[PDB]
Design a protein around this ligand. Structure first.
Ligand SMILES: Nc1nc2c(ncn2[C@@H]2O[C@@H]3COP(=O)(O)O[C@H]4[C@@H](O)[C@H](n5cnc6c(=O)[nH]c(N)nc65)O[C@@H]4COP(=O)(O)O[C@H]3[C@H]2O)c(=O)[nH]1
Ligand SMILES: Nc1nc2c(ncn2[C@@H]2O[C@@H]3COP(=O)(O)O[C@H]4[C@@H](O)[C@H](n5cnc6c(=O)[nH]c(N)nc65)O[C@@H]4COP(=O)(O)O[C@H]3[C@H]2O)c(=O)[nH]1
Length: 226
């Protein structure tokens, strides 16, 4: 795929830095190709070698090995990483199976989020009616100045809503004009992504304050871990 060209790393040391960081942090890697996917890990990296853990499933390992053009994505703090390799070949690392490949000559280091996102806790409830007058309810997952993630029905990306209630318990209750911008999966549990519409400056300051206090509270409690 493609992202803003500012996100594309091409300097070999640039590409390598990002990869060494995935390794040192043990970030899970998601391999996908035409017809399958599997979770792996960066086991070791040199300028000439990428070594990836085998998958858990013998069938996925057989199917990666005959694939071409394999996309690898990883989710780190503050970024999404993504690159492609032409093929994986079997090897051994520390006496156990592994995939080896030449590193990609380029990689995406994707950082599109303008606003900080804080995770919701003890769960917070939300609810809205649908065009057929039933009531959709879901659990808030995370929160930013411009939107919210929710965990759970037949809906469609692009759906716009108007009066969506957010009971954040001890803090208080609010609503927003939000648009369902992404339906995905999270563990087989479905996940919604909302961007807020028509957020007045008054509400912006409210959202700022709540996000602040939740962050500060996590800080205070974790200090208390002492
Ligand atoms: N349209 C839209 N959809 C959103 C937005 N936020 C979350 N989603 C949807 O929710 C899925 C999961 O987001 P996540 O848990 O933060 O999990 C994300 C997050 O860890 C990371 N990621 C992707 N892009 C970025 C980024 O630009 N910045 C950061 N820091 N992480 C990113 O990769 C994971 C998977 O990303 P996806 O495959 O795209 O899958 C995303 C996407 O379908 C958004 O602002 N707009
Ligand atoms: N807490 C929370 N807030 C959400 C969620 N989804 C959307 N928002 C809010 O909605 C704003 C605009 O979303 P957008 O139009 O998809 O525009 C997004 C989208 O195009 C893209 N993007 C950011 N993160 C992701 C991601 O994880 N996956 C994908 N596919 N796209 C992303 O970058 C643009 C800017 O991202 P932001 O500055 O963060 O701005 C986001 C964020 O403030 C969510 O799941 N959780």
């Amino acid at each position: 795929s493609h992202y803003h060209e500012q996100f594309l790393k091409q300097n070999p040391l640039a590409v390598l830095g990002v990869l060494r960081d995935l390794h040192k942090a043990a970030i899970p890697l998601r391999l996908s190709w035409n017809g399958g996917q599997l979770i792996s890990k960066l086991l070791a990296i040199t300028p000439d070698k990428l070594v990836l853990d085998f998958g858990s499933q013998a069938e996925d390992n057989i199917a990666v090995l005959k694939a071409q053009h394999i996309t690898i994505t990883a989710e780190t703090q503050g970024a999404k990483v993504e690159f492609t390799v032409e093929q994986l070949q079997q090897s051994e690392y520390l006496q156990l199976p592994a995939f080896i490949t030449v590193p990609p000559p380029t990689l995406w280091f994707v950082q599109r989020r303008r606003y900080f996102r804080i995770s919701a806790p003890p769960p917070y409830f939300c609810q809205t009616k649908l065009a057929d007058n039933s009531t959709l309810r879901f659990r808030l997952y995370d929160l930013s100045l411009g939107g919210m993630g929710a965990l759970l029905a037949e809906l469609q990306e692009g759906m716009r809503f108007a009066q969506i209630e957010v009971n954040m318990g001890q803090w208080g209750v609010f609503h927003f004009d939000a648009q369902l911008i992404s339906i995905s999966e999270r563990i087989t549990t479905p996940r919604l992504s909302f961007r807020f519409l028509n957020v007045s400056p008054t509400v912006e300051r409210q959202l700022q304050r709540i996000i602040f206090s939740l962050e500060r509270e996590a800080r205070e409690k974790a200090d208390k871990v002492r």
